[PDB]
Amino acid sequence: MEKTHVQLSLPVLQVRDVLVRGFGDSVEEVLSEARQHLKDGTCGLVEVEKGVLPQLEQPYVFIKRSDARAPHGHVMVELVAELEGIQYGRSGETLGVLVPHVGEIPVAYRKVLLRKN
Ligand SMILES: C[C@H](N)c1ccc(Cl)cc1
């Protein structure tokens, strides 16, 4: 059975390498697909810097810090989607935007403890 949180190590991708620049076409779909790719080990993370979001496809799926005081290095996170400037969920600081991973070479791995909600 699925625990409330799962430890994952996500490949961190540079935005210009990403081949599939979002998870879908509605908030509900992107959240659903992100969660599936996270379970399958086929989800990457792009760190948000100036110029990143316009190079990715909306709706966006962010991982945001959900909790403080981070077990074994994995930051606790939850998913929040964004479309047209409106966010679906509320949480803490953004760690990055999730994208499909289809074999791109990462620059780093990001350890997270993901809330499965
Ligand atoms: C497994 C298949 N080649 C696939 C990769 C990425 C996405 Cl987003 C959907 C399907």
Numbering used by the authors: 9 to 77, 79 to 126
What does the paper say about this structure?
Whereas the previous three fragment hits can be considered as chemically closely related analogues, 7H2 represents a smaller fragment of 155 Da containing a single central phenyl ring with two distinct substituents binding to a shallower site on nsp1. Due to its quasi-symmetrical structure, a rotation around its long axis does not lead to a new distinct orientation, as the ethan-1-amine substituent contains a rotatable bond. However, a vertical axis through its phenyl ring will lead to two distinct orientations with each of the two substituents changing positions. For 7H2, only one anomalous peak at the binding pocket is visible in the 4.5 keV anomalous difference Fourier map at rmsd of 4.0. The peak disappears in the 2.75 keV anomalous difference Fourier map (same rmsd level), consistent with the existence of a single chlorine in 7H2. Consequently, we fitted 7H2 into the density with the chloro substituent located at the centre of the anomalous peak, in the opposite direction of our previously published orientation. The overlapping local electron density maps for these residues are exemplified using the nsp1-7H2 complex at two diffraction energies.
Nsp1 is a two-domain protein with a short C-terminal domain, which is involved in the shutdown of host expression by blocking the entry of host mRNA in the ribosome. The C-terminal domain is connected via a linker region with the larger N-terminal domain, which is thought to be involved in circumventing the shutdown of expression of viral mRNA and stabilising the binding of the C-terminus to the ribosome. Therefore, nsp1 is considered as a potential target for antiviral drug discovery. Using sulphur and chlorine anomalous difference Fourier maps, we report the unambiguous identification of the binding orientation of four nsp1-targeting fragment hits.
